[PDB]
A paper describes a structure:
[name] is an important epigenetic regulator and plays a key role in the maintenance of DNA methylation during DNA replication. To explore the molecular mechanism for [name]-mediated stabilization of [name], we determined the crystal structure of human [name] in complex with [name]. Structural and biochemical analyses reveal that the interaction is mainly mediated by the KG linker of [name] and a previously uncharacterized acidic pocket that acts as a substrate-binding site near the C-terminus of [name].
We next determined the crystal structure of [name] (residues 600–1,600, designated as [name] if not specified) in complex with TUDUSP7 at 2.9 Å resolution. In the [name]–[name] structure, TUDUSP7 consist of three separate modules, UBL1–2, UBL3 and UBL4–5, which are connected by two hinge regions flanking UBL3 and collectively adopt an extended conformation. Superposition of the UBL4–5 domains from the two structures results in a separation of the respective UBL1–2 domains by as much as 40 Å. This analysis indicates that complex formation leads to a significant conformational change in TUDUSP7, which primarily occurs at the hinge regions flanking the UBL3 domain. Interface-1 primarily involves the KG linker of [name] (residues 1,109–1,119, designated as KGDNMT1) and an acidic groove on the surface of UBL1–2USP7. Residue K1111DNMT1 snugly inserts into an acidic cave formed by residues E736, D758, E759 and D764 of [name]. Residue K1115DNMT1 binds to the carbonyl oxygen atoms of residues D684 and D762 of [name]. The Interface-2 involves TRDDNMT1 and UBL3USP7, with a buried surface area of 676 Å2. Taken together, the KGDNMT1 (especially residue K1111) and the acidic pocket of the TUDUSP7 on the Interface-1 are important for the interaction between [name] and [name]. An acetylation mimic mutant (DNMT14KQ) or acetylation of four Lysine residues on the KG linker of [name] led to a decrease in its binding affinity to [name] and a decrease in its protein stability.
Numbering used by the authors:
A (entry chain C): 555 to 1083
B (entry chain A): 615 to 633, 702 to 853, 860 to 952, 962 to 979, 984 to 1115, 1133 to 1600
């Protein structure tokens, strides 16, 4: 928000005490997110001495009873306590000591107040020949880390001489055999093979803030799933908390599972399926959008990536989510569904846009079955559905339900319609009653419009009964119907039909003998819109 | 519009000269050119030869002088002389006198640094008869051979060379030179700068110095030793070909270097009447990519007198596994990154001679960068996350001695960003070239010229900060030369100093035949867009210049287009070269050879050609050019191998949703994750709700039926078509193809059926017009003209998932010349998106117009990966100029 006239003249100095180091199960000293600081807003030009006075007074210590160890970042990405000389550097501005860094974190080393009331004070530290080591103890049985404080020790000291300290600081019986590692960085824990060598030799690039992890040398450790601190830090390095969410469920808070970076699709699916009490194959997964919070690309069953690949574009700050949905069919069958866009015609003779997903290898029957599963039918009608093919607002065909879906191309002008068969068309008299294709058109017959339909035809019909049937279907205006011009269309020619003469019989609707292949005669209506 | 806008220079070049892949190479190969001055020569009879002054320096057997006198004519060091060929042949040997000395052992001697006749370069008859070119070619010679003292001047570029474009040649006739000439690579470059010390000042020869540098650079030598044993001697670093190899560095090896411990029906001729035309089709595959090893030991064996043999430098290495090298084999490559490897404890010893280059192979976790940032930050970078055990056929975490000893990352204890070149892209198209160049990070294309409107629109869409001209390039250049600031619509014209880089692909149409120029075709080429483009080059004088075209550009009119282009560039004072590149070697699956012409300004460094990144089918990788019986290659040192595996059709379009014949949908869902490295590159890391231009042409019912009757098996085309009656989608009936004639050459079916469709099989040259057949599943026209066109192999053919695209065309037609367009599985021609994918276009790259427009835009484009490679090769030169 709003800055201030001289907000730029200040800097955050974050003091951390050793009590924050206890309980930390991860790498380095503490978790940046979980650590509690004592924060100081300090003038950049303030001297170190002024800040030491201020700190000592504020937190309740004598100035000669505290030592400052600035938390300093290393190339590997770690952050460890570094050396600061209270005397020598005391006159330097805080901003130059921090090296323009801000906020600037500092470790505060004090004497234990319960060991100081007994009279003890702050030990001396030789910058050139001493070093401050931090000690952790790994327990394989509980698979956990126990902070064992720090020590001042000469560089030339032998590893073997640090063992008694490690033992009695962890509550170990003395002369207990110990396995020693250096926690160099996340995913790098290096065992110390020779205890008879000095610290300098044993540890490459030996610095203040270095960490030695140690554990019992005990066969029982092989019963633990993480027998050594090495494997512990490894498993920890690849450990990740994933939030699984159902994309169907609105605002699903989802559930959190702790998993490994290395896991493949099979393992993840198995896990989620377990916590959901279902078959893994009945699960489809979605990678996150990841800038937005929401489901992204779906995963194929054969997806060859790992969990890390799926979560890699989340920030380390961000909650790592993974989407999914439960399926009614095994995911392979679900992947073999064909997106089929078509039109559903209802009881009200009104068009709706629908998209169905029959099996890609299925027949027309399966499509119609999907559409039947999707809709409601008339109060009473056939209960049987059919598939029409319409081009230029004209029905160019009916597809038999055994026909293959792969032979259909729902193109631009090509519209596939699904409709419930009317009762008087289900079973008709085949050599008597005939189903005719009907369409609208304004002026000439090329220009066409409206919803085309199939109409039943009797014998010597008395044509205005058939037209009151048509009218019974349409129902727009009440004898604006009157302006309807009725025509018979064949190969582009059209003959208008006299309404009161009643000329009807099938013979005027079939093509030449043995003819299917080229377009059949159809009924035409004129009235525009 | 006919006459091309031109500069007086270029116009004079093309006036003073006065008087569709035909696959010009399947080659009766040539060793080629054969340093030219070898052999004997005619000595001259000279009456008096005497040393002027006294010896400036005396050496072991020679005594050097500053100046000599032959028959009353003086002759100093630095002068030039003419010597006569022993053969009656015309060429008159010319040289520069680099040193004069008396050798009592041998006689009166001088060192001749030869010139090259301009007509003995690639230029040939096009060259200025007075022009010479520096070469590395020098020899000691007895003074008696000198026929005459000839004058040769150095045509140095003016301090105002960049503005001399458009100025008339008025600005006597003697021998002159301006450029050094590499004969193998056909490289015209600025004269070498190498200076003498003052001790050799009198005898100094540039050719000798460069020969020294070269031959000293290419002898492998060990550097600093660190351990001596009973049988051998160990070193920390060896060096070869200028590159330095320390212990722990990555090493390229041939597939021959080491091996991995891993254990490695008759046809119905009634139903299939044309299948027999495949039996003449029953090609070496792509090579294995480089073996990759890590240097563990560098050692030389002792000669067993107890001293190391340093001619026999040897390397002990750790083997790396490519995912495809494991037991999971080739399918492990599908999802994996191309630079991904696995560590192994397997080792092998190889000669240092076998090393083909140094690479960087890191452990992915110790990288400060994310893996992909690392992968896209430098030329030769590989990484591993795991280690492979061939014995257990398993994967585990790498050993600790494998995480490079160099970065611990603790402490002591106890990125040059160039300004982008303002680029002018002539005949830009939708801008694939400019795209690749933008990816190289060397260019900002601010001006483009494209007459075809949809392509111009596309370029605008992909480059909103640029100015696209749709007017003829000639009238624009004419506008600029007339001192006009803008064109008619107010668009600002580029001016001298604005254009820093000039790139383009001029159409060759009408001169594109192979055979010699006549006055007609030369009249057409005289005003071609090539001459216009070269005129743009001469006028604007950019730092760099690229002319890309079809390969046969180097062979057009018996290489005269090429020779004249090069000649013109040389006349401008440019350093220049040419070469052929296969796009497939640079990260796409396509076969697409391109002729590349490069040019750099005098103050610049001439770019090399990109070293091939990907292995590719050898048949598609013939890069050499024959000009006037000389074979010219490029600087490319990679012939048989490459760092990365070949890109395939599977890599290219396996992630795309299944669509159908005549798919019209412009915006659809990807409906999945990227399945490959390639797809990952072209789609990006960010989520993409919309996939654009996955669309197919709408083929007639007949063609659709044919397509759906083509088998899915690799190698399938029209010759696998069954002859059958088919019911077409429109209701039409497709009749069986009838065979009405006996075919002489092809004989008779096992059944005894006739194989001819027409009378013309009898050579009678009739073509019974009544015998033509229509609406057949098996197209009549293909067996009709089959025998003459290699049985029309590939037509109505399907792409192979493991294969690659034939050159991506502008309008894919199943019966076209390029005509294997079909999808490997689905029945349809490949989509626009798929062609763009085959061209290396990012999926976010925008096209314009109807489907044929987009197809064409994609087809005429330079693959952005190729242009990126070239662009990086230019970036090196940008960096080198300091
Ligand atoms: Zn020489
Ligand atoms: Zn014929």
């Amino acid at each position: 928000g709003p800055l201030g006239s001289e907000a730029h003249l200040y800097m955050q100095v974050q003091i951390v005490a050793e009590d924050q180091f206890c309980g930390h199960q991860g790498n380095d000293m503490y978790d940046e997110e979980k650590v509690k600081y004592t924060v100081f807003k300090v003038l950049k030009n303030s001297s170190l001495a002024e800040f030491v006075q201020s700190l000592s007074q504020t937190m309740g210590f004598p100035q000669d009873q505290i030592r400052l160890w600035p938390m300093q970042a290393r190339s590997n990405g770690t952050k460890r306590p570094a050396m600061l000389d209270n005397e020598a550097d005391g006159n330097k501005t805080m901003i130059e000591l921090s090296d323009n860094e801000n906020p600037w974190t500092i470790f505060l080393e004090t004497v234990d107040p319960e060991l100081a009331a007994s009279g003890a004070t702050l030990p001396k530290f030789d910058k050139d020949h001493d070093v401050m080591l931090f000690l952790k103890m790994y327990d394989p049985k509980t698979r956990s880390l126990n902070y064992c404080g720090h020590i001042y020790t000469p560089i030339s000291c032998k590893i073997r001489d640090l063992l008694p300290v490690m033992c009695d600081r962890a509550g170990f019986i003395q002369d207990t055999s110990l396995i020693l590692y250096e926690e160099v960085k996340p995913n790098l824990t290096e065992r110390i093979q020779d205890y008879d060598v000095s610290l300098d030799k044993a540890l490459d690039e030996l610095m203040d803030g270095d960490i030695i992890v140690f554990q019992k040398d005990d066969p029982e450790n092989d019963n633990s799933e993480l027998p050594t601190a090495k494997e512990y830090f490894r498993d920890l390095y690849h450990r990740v908390d994933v939030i699984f969410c159902d994309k169907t469920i609105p605002n699903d808070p989802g559930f959190v599972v702790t998993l490994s970076n290395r896991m493949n699709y099979f393992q993840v699916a198995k896990t989620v399926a377990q916590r959901l009490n279902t078959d893994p194959m009945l699960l489809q997964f979605f990678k996150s959008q990841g800038y937005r919070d929401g489901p992204g690309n779906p995963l194929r069953h054969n997806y060859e990536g790992t969990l890390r690949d799926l979560l890699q574009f989340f920030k380390p700050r961000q909650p790592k989510k993974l989407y999914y949905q439960q399926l009614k069919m095994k995911i392979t069958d679900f992947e073999n569904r064909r997106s089929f866009k078509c039109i559903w015609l209802n009881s009200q003779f009104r068009e709706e846009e629908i998209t169905l997903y029959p099996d890609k290898h299925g027949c027309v029957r399966d499509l119609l079955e999907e559409c039947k599963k999707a809709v409601e039918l008339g109060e009473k009608a056939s209960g049987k559905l059919r598939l029409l093919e319409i081009v230029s607002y004209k029905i160019i065909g009916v597809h038999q339900e055994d026909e293959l879906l792969e032979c259909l191309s729902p193109a631009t002008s090509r519209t596939f319609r699904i409709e419930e068969i009317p009762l008087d068309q289900v079973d008709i008299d085949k050599e008597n009653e005939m189903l005719v294709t009907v369409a609208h058109f304004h002026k000439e017959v090329f220009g066409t419009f409206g919803i085309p339909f199939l109409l039943r035809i009797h014998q010597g019909e008395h044509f205005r009964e058939v037209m009151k049937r048509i009218q019974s279907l349409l129902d727009i205006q009440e004898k604006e119907f009157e302006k309807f011009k009725f025509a018979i269309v064949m190969m582009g020619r059209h003959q208008y039909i006299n309404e009161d003469e009643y000329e009807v019989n099938l013979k005027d609707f079939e093509p030449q003998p043995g003819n299917m292949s080229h377009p059949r005669p159809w009924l035409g209506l004129d009235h525009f819109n | 519009p006919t006459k091309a806008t031109t500069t007086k220079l270029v116009y004079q070049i093309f006036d003073t000269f006065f008087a569709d892949e035909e696959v010009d190479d399947n080659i009766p190969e040539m060793p080629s050119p054969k340093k030219m001055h070898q052999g004997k020569k005619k000595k001259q009879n000279k009456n008096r030869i005497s040393w002027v002054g006294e010896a400036v320096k005396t050496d072991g057997k020679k005594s050097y002088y500053k100046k000599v006198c032959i028959d009353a004519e003086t002759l100093e060091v630095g002068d030039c002389v003419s010597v006569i060929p022993d053969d009656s042949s015309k060429p008159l040997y010319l040289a520069r006198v680099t040193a004069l000395w008396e050798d009592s052992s041998n006689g009166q001697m001088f060192h001749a640094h030869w010139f090259c006749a301009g007509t003995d370069t690639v230029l040939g008859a096009t060259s200025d008869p007075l022009e010479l070119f520096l070469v590395d070619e020098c020899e000691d010679m007895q003074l008696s051979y000198i026929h005459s003292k000839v004058k040769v001047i150095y045509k140095a570029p003016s301090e105002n060379w960049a503005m001399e474009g458009g100025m008339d040649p008025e600005s006597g006739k003697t021998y002159f030179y301006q450029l050094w000439y590499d004969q193998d690579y056909a490289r015209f470059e600025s004269p070498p700068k190498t200076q003498p010390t003052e001790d050799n000042k009198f005898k100094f020869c540039v050719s000798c110095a460069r020969l020294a540098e070269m031959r000293q650079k290419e002898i492998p030598r060990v550097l600093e030793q660190l351990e001596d044993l009973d049988s051998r001697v160990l070193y920390y670093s060896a060096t070869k070909n200028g590159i330095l190899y320390r212990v722990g560095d990555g090493v390229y090896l041939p597939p021959e270097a080491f091996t991995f411990n891993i254990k490695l029906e008759p046809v119905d001729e009634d139903l299939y009447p044309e299948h027999y035309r495949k039996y003449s089709d029953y090609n070496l595959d792509a090579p294995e990519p480089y073996r990759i090893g890590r240097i563990k030991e560098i050692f030389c064996p002792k000669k067993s007198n107890g001293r190391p043999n340093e001619t026999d430098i040897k390397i002990r290495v750790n083997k790396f596994y490519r995912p495809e090298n494991t037991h999971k084999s080739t399918p492990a490559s599908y999802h994996a990154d191309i630079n991904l490897l696995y560590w192994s404890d397997e080792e092998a010893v190889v000669d240092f001679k076998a090393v083909q280059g140094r690479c960087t192979v890191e452990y992915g976790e110790d990288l400060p960068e994310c893996v992909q940032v690392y992968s896209m930050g430098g030329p030769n970078r590989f990484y591993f996350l795991e280690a492979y055990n061939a014995k257990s056929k398993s994967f585990e975490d790498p050993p600790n001695h494998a995480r490079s000893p160099g970065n611990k990352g603790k402490g002591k204890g106890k990125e040059i960003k160039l300004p982008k070149l303002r680029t002018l892209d002539v005949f830009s198209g939708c801008g694939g070239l400019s795209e690749g160049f933008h990816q190289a990070g060397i260019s900002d294309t601010l001006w483009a010229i494209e007459m075809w409107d949809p392509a111009a629109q596309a370029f605008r869409l992909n480059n909103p900060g640029s100015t696209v001209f749709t007017e003829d390039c000639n009238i624009l250049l004419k506008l600029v030369m007339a001192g006009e600031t803008t064109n008619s619509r107010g668009q600002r014209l580029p001016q001298k100093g604005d254009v820093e880089m000039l790139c383009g692909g001029p159409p060759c149409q009408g001169f594109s035949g192979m055979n010699r120029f006549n006055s007609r075709t030369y009249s057409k080429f005289k005003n071609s867009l090539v001459v216009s483009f070269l005129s743009y080059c001469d006028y604007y004088r950019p730092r760099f210049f690229l002319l890309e075209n079809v390969r046969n550009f180097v062979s057009f009119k018996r290489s005269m287009v090429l020779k004249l282009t090069l000649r013109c560039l040389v006349r401008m004072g440019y350093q220049c070269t040419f070469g052929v590149l296969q796009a497939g070697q640079y990260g796409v699956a396509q076969t697409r050879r391109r002729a590349i012409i490069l040019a750099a300004a005098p103050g610049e460094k001439l770019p090399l050609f990109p070293e091939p990144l990907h292995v590719f089918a050898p048949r598609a990788c013939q890069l050499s050019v024959v000009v006037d019986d000389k074979k010219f290659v490029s600087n490319i040192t990679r012939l048989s191998s490459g760092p990365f595996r070949t890109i395939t059709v599977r890599d290219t379009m396996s992630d795309l949703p299944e669509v159908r014949n005549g798919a019209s949908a412009l915006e659809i869902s990807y409906n999945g994750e990227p399945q490959s490295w390639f797809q990952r590159q072209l789609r990006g890391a960010q989520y993409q709700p919309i996939l654009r231009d996955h669309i197919c042409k709408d083929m007639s019912a007949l063609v659709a039926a044919r397509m759906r009757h083509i088998p899915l098996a690799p190698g399938s085309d029209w010759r696998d078509l069954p002859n059958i009656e088919v019911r077409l989608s429109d209701g039409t009936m497709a009749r069986k193809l009838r065979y009405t004639h006996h075919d002489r050459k092809n004989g008779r079916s096992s059944s005894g059926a006739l194989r001819g469709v027409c009378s013309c099989v009898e050579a009678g040259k009739a073509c019974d017009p009544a015998a033509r057949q229509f609406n057949t599943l098996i197209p009549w026209c293909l067996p009709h003209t089959g025998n003459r066109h290699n049985h029309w192999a590939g037509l109505y053919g399907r792409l192979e998932w493991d294969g690659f695209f034939s050159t991506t065309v502008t309008n894919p037609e199943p019966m076209g010349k390029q005509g294997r367009v079909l999808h490997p599985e689905q029945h349809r021609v490949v989509s626009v998106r798929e062609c763009a994918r085959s061209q290396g276009f990012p999926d976010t790259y925008r096209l314009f117009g109807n489907i044929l427009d987009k197809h064409r835009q994609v087809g005429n484009a330079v693959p952005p990966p190729l242009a990126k490679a070239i662009g990086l090769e230019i970036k090196l030169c940008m960096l080198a100029k300091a």
